[PDB]
């Protein structure tokens, strides 16, 4: 019904963007870890939202109904 992979756009507090190519079944903790590493901040200092809802570590794009080029927002925790 859908592809195996998805591109997600992560928008940070300063409006900058990093895009991620993610398998639909990957736990989104992996995206949180990579994003925090690129920003040089502790992962625990950030919260990641999709459609205004907190993304859990074990949430996957498939579970959340994410689609190509959907936005994840990053706010300070």
């Amino acid at each position: 019904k859908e592809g195996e992979y998805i591109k997600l756009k992560v928008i940070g507090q300063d409006s900058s963007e990093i895009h991620f190519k993610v398998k639909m079944t990957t736990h989104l903790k992996k995206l949180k870890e990579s994003y925090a590493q690129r920003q040089g901040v502790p992962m625990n200092s950030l919260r990641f939202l999709f459609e205004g809802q907190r993304i859990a570590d074990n949430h996957t794009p498939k579970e959340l109904g994410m689609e190509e080029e959907d936005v994840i927002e990053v706010y300070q925790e």
Binding site: F20, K21, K23, K30, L31, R38
Partner: peptide
Amino acid sequence: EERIISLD
């Protein structure tokens, strides 16, 4: 610059 990261 566009930034695309491949996640495993």
